[PDB]
Amino acid sequence: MKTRYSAEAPARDELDRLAGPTLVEFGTDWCGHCQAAQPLLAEVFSDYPEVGHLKVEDGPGRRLGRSFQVKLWPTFVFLRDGREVARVVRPGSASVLEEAFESLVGEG
């Protein structure tokens, strides 16, 4: 991906006003969790470019993963209509991440 994480993210109630298939990702551009999960997303997302992605910088920016009640810090919540349809916690392998992407894009 050509752009990095953003601290300038919305609040959880401002996010709730969006509408469309939107993945919201918590992390940073610099954590060792992210150095593994970022190229994971980059591999899966190349087949699903119609999905939205929001990189929320959980260090300097809004603590959005608190209000999603995130389990492990490298997590991304799949929204639709601006509300949760699923999430992936700790991807590990593209076989787990791709399996969720097709399920939430509607190609399942």
Contact 54, 24 (CB under 8 A): yes
Contact 33, 58 (CB under 8 A): no
Q: Is 56 a catalytic residue?
A: no
DSSP class of 6: B
Residue among 34, 37, 70, 88 flagged as catalytic: 34
Q: Is 31 a catalytic residue?
A: yes
Q: Which domains does the chain have, with CATH numbers?
A: 1-108 (3.40.30.10)
Segments of the chain assigned E as strands: 22-27, 52-57, 75-80, 83-89
The approach used to solve this structure was NMR
Distance of CA 24 to the CA centre of its chain: 3
Q: Hey, what are 19's tokens?
A: 């509408």
Residue among 10, 18, 21, 31 flagged as catalytic: 31
Tell me the sheet residues that pair with 76.
Answer: 25, 88
> In this structure, are strands 83-89 and 52-57 parallel, antiparallel, or unpaired?
unpaired
As a whole number of angstroms, the distance between CA 108 and CA 104 comes to 7
As a whole number of angstroms, the distance between CA 26 and CA 59 comes to 10
